[PDB]
Write a protein that binds this ligand. Structure first.
Ligand code: M00
Length: 353
């Protein structure tokens, strides 16, 4: 029998690792995306299945753009590959660009669920080694990402807290529980190359809980089949309320639990837009970012700065105020886009109730 070594983690980090590696949380997410968890168990989920899923969605995309199969014939093949559960009734046809991108977004989450499952596989070295770490230490070690819990006294604590409270829902106030500094090793070098590229900003990136382990393992990515209102890049917001909309919040006890990322984004020369462009794959030449400007913006006169690795990083601190220039924008709130993974570094992780 193998000796289980004691857990080295603080209670808040243990709780976080318990939450983001939880089998029930992953199944819950699949259930919330109307996936058939009985026909698709966590352990049966595979890279081949997800690939076959995206192949079926691409065929549907070609039909949506000949004498080929009908949209219902092609939809039926997608549901055979990715079993859904609509109370065991006939699943609906994927006959619109809005339905298609939603199905792609579902598979991107499912790919991050499969990645967390693949990450937890027992290596041959582990089978030979005569002791084992506590399961939470093992999961933490697999992320290959340093997490450091901040106390109310850390220099950035009050700055982050003000950012959260001033730009979050005025009535549906997100309650801050914990902040971890995130040091993803193998993400430092690519981001540091952009040292001469300024206009650095700390921006929100909200996700569901089932993709947090994959992000701590791999960083924010520009995945194939990804997209949205401002194309194929990494989406950020300066308003917490915009990023919070993407946080489902899992029920636990008498409260909700969710996680939010803060990323350091080197925006450099910004290109501003006031209308949707799902076809963008990069900024225009000579630009380093695309900012879909909203009707509001956290009061720029209230911006502060944080020193992160000897670089000034703008941190908004004001409530949203109107922006007359973008009063007629198709965006109510700003969306910040970068099209190179190296222009982002994860910096903080927040637990919110
Ligand atoms: C493809 C769905 C998943 C895979 O992780 N993506 C997310 O949950 C990111 C969602 C998100 N979208 C935004 C869009 C505009 C502005 C901000 C955000 C944001 O914070 N998260």
């Amino acid at each position: 029998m193998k000796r289980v070594q004691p857990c080295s983690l603080d209670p808040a980090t243990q709780k976080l690792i318990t939450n983001i590696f939880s089998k029930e949380m992953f199944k819950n997410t699949m259930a919330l995306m109307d996936l058939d968890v009985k026909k698709m168990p966590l352990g049966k989920l595979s890279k081949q299945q997800i690939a076959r899923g995206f192949e079926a969605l691409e065929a549907l995309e070609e039909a949506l753009k000949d004498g080929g199969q009908s949209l219902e014939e092609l939809s039926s093949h997608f549901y055979t590959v990715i079993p859904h559960n609509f109370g065991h009734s006939q699943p609906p046809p994927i006959n619109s660009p809005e339905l298609l991108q939603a199905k792609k977004d579902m598979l991107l989450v499912l790919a991050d669920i499969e990645l967390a499952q693949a990450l937890q596989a027992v290596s041959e070295q582990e089978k030979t080694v005569e002791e084992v770490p506590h399961p939470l230490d093992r999961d933490y070690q697999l992320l290959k990402c340093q997490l450091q819990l901040l106390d109310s006294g850390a220099p950035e604590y009050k700055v982050i807290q003000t950012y959260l409270e001033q730009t979050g829902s005025n009535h549906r106030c997100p309650t801050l529980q914990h902040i971890w500094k995130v040091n993803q090793e193998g993400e430092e070098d690519r981001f540091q190359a952009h040292s001469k590229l300024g206009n650095r900003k700390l921006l929100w990136h909200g996700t569901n809980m089932a993709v947090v382990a994959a992000i701590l393992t791999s960083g924010l990515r520009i995945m194939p089949h990804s997209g949205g209102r401002v194309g194929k890049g990494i989406y950020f917001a300066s308003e917490n309320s915009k990023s919070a909309g993407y946080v489902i919040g899992m029920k636990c006890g008498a409260h909700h639990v969710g996680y939010m990322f803060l990323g350091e984004v080197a925006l450099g020369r910004e290109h501003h837009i006031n209308t949707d462009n799902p076809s963008l794959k990069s900024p225009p030449p000579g630009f380093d970012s695309v900012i879909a400007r909203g009707h509001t913006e956290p009061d720029p006169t209230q911006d502060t700065e944080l020193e992160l690795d000897g670089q000034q990083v703008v941190v908004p601190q004001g409530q949203p105020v109107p922006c007359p220039e973008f009063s007629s924008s198709t965006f109510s709130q700003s969306e910040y886009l970068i099209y190179q993974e190296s222009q982002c570094r994860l910096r903080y992780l927040l637990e919110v109730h």
